[PDB]
């Protein structure tokens, strides 16, 4: 009788959306978000807080609702939207990631979608005082297309970028819905800047960290990762930082790799053997088991051939901490093509084995409620990624990133 998304149905009776697009994003996103907040054991107060904050802060920057065939600025979050939900398993914590965008980006009034992230932060900082954007100001120059870079783009690239055909994402904001309060993260995608300058994504990322790391506290950590990227031949990197006072920030360098094999994931996990710690060694054994049990699909190396069956690359991020001698790895395993019931079976057995019986018991039930009425045996594109990190202290750290149905 009392639905799991009651908080969504309740706020629906009280929120007056100013336009059809915000209305459609609320109805598309809020039911699943409400369920994930119930599942994560957030208090009723915090469920209402986060749903209302989503409505007030996030829905106005999701852009025109991307109805089938609509000529709008495109994004790939959640598969084909400007918003993606993910959940971390430890209770659970939910995360909302989105590319801030306004309609002007679809109608020729913001070619490289530069203004929306700025409009978004100016609203976010009014509600979440702990959000500090000093790093947004410092990093933008190094990781995004500047006026000077744009003057270097050729006729073919400019015509290609003039339409809504190309994905032009440079910024993604993630709101980590912690029970102690929201922490915002900013992702910088140097792809467009690099198309103009000729620099690699990894060179842009390290140059940005160096420009920001004033006392060179991260230099040795950077050198270790750089050397691995040079040796393993990886250029396609992007950066993530916490939007807190620069003193207290954490940088994560991400890489995407089209070669989807356990051997390639292992090579990146250990940074070509440079990561010698006990925690990384235990983690790789757990990964070997997970990769095998899940049966991660090896797709084509060509990006256009890869998207034919809707396959994803592997990804990793390396977390940098001033004090530590070694970076901390995180592996993202692509799950598109694997039936949802298979993933649920492997996850349930994993939780049981790693002393998380409360997670194991509800995994399937909760997944089925997010995709109510959908056949989870037939579906292969709902749970898109599984991320894995490990510490002896806290145990396995697993996250699921969801794609919107159909």
Binding of a second copy at residue 56 (CB under 8 A)?
yes
Q: What is the CA radius of gyration of the chain?
A: 21
CB of residue 284 to a second copy, shortest distance in Å: 41
Task: Give how far Cα 264 sits from Cα of 258, 333, 337, Å.
Answer: 10, 12, 20
Among 113, 383, 387, 399, binds Na ion (CB under 5 A): 383
Among 127, 162, 167, 322, binds a second copy (CB under 8 A): 127
CA dist., res. 398 & res. 183, Å (int): 19
Binding of Na ion at residue 294 (CB under 5 A)?
no
Nearer to Cl ion, 58 or 240 (CB): 240
Binding of Na ion at residue 376 (CB under 5 A)?
no
Binding of Cl ion at residue 87 (CB under 5 A)?
no
Task: Give how far Cα 263 sits from Cα of 201, 266, 287, 288, 303, Å.
Answer: 23, 5, 11, 9, 20
Q: Which of residues 150-209 bind Cl ion (CB under 5 A)?
A: none
Which residues touch 360 (CB under 8 Å, ≥6 apart)? 347, 348, 349, 351, 352
DSSP assignment, residue 105?
A: G
Q: Is 397 among the annotated ligand-binding positions? A: yes
Q: Which of residues 10-29 bind a second copy (CB under 8 A)?
A: 10-11, 13-16
DSSP assignment, residue 405?
A: -
Q: Of Na ion, Cl ion, a second copy, none, which one sits near residue 13, judging by CB under 5 to 8 A according to partner kind?
A: a second copy
Got the DSSP string for 293-334?
HHT-----SSHHHHTTTT---EEEEEEE-TT-SS-EEEEEEE
Contact stretch for a second copy (CB under 8 A) within 49-57, 183-191, 228-236, 279-287: 49-57
CA dist., res. 334 & res. 330, Å (int): 13
Q: Is 23 among the annotated ligand-binding positions? A: no
Binding of Cl ion at residue 126 (CB under 5 A)?
no
Helices within 213-299 (DSSP H only): 219-232, 262-269, 278-294
Residue nearest to Na ion (CB): 335
CB of residue 333 to a second copy, shortest distance in Å: 34
Known binding-site positions for substrate: 76, 84, 189
Known binding-site positions: 76, 84, 95, 185, 187, 189, 252, 254, 332, 397, 401
Binding site for a second copy (CB under 8 A): 6-7, 10-11, 13-16, 44-46, 48-50, 52-53, 56-57, 123, 126-127
């Amino acid at each position: 009788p009392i639905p799991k998304d009651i908080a969504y149905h309740t706020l629906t009776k009280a929120l007056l959306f100013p336009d059809i697009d915000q209305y459609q994003h609320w109805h598309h996103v809020a039911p699943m978000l409400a369920k994930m907040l119930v599942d994560g054991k957030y208090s009723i107060h915090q469920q209402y807080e986060y749903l209302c904050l989503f409505a007030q802060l996030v829905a106005p920057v999701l852009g025109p609702y991307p109805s089938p065939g609509r000529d709008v600025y495109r994004c790939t979050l959640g598969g084909n939207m400007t918003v993606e939900l993910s959940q971390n398993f430890q209770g659970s914590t939910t995360r909302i990631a989105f590319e801030p965008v306004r309609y002007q980006a679809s109608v020729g009034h913001d070619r490289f979608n530069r203004t929306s992230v700025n409009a978004f932060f100016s609203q976010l900082q009014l509600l979440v005082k702990s959000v500090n954007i000093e790093l947004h100001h410092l990093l933008s120059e190094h990781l995004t297309l500047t006026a000077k870079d744009e003057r270097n783009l050729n006729e073919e690239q400019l015509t290609k970028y003039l339409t809504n055909f190309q994905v032009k994402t440079q910024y993604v904001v993630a709101l980590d819905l912690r029970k102690t309060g929201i922490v915002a993260k900013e992702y910088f995608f140097p792809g467009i800047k690099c198309a103009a300058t000729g620099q690699t994504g990894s060179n842009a990322c390290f140059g940005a960290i160096r420009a920001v790391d004033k006392d060179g506290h991260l230099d040795s950590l950077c050198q270790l990762i750089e050397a691995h990227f040079q040796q393993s031949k990886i250029d396609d990197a992007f950066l993530c930082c916490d939007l807190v006072d620069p003193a207290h920030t954490r940088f994560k360098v991400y890489i995407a790799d089209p070669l989807v094999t356990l051997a390639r994931a292992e090579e990146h996990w250990t940074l070509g053997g440079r990561l010698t710690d006990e925690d990384a060694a235990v983690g790789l054994e757990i990964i070997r088991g997970l990769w095998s049990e899940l049966g991660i699909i090896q797709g084509p190396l060509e990006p256009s051939a890869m998207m034919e069956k809707g396959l994803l690359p592997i990804m990793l991020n390396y977390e940098m901490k001033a004090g530590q001698r070694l970076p901390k790895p995180k592996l993202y395993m692509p799950l598109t093509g694997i039936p949802e019931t298979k993933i649920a079976r492997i996850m349930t057995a994993f939780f049981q084995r790693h002393d998380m019986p409360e997670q194991a018991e509800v995994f399937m039930e909760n997944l089925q409620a997010y995709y109510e009425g959908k056949n989870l045996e037939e579906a292969t594109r709902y749970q898109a990624w599984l991320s894995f990190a490990y510490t002896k202290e806290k145990g396995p750290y697993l996250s699921i990133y969801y794609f919107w149905p159909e």
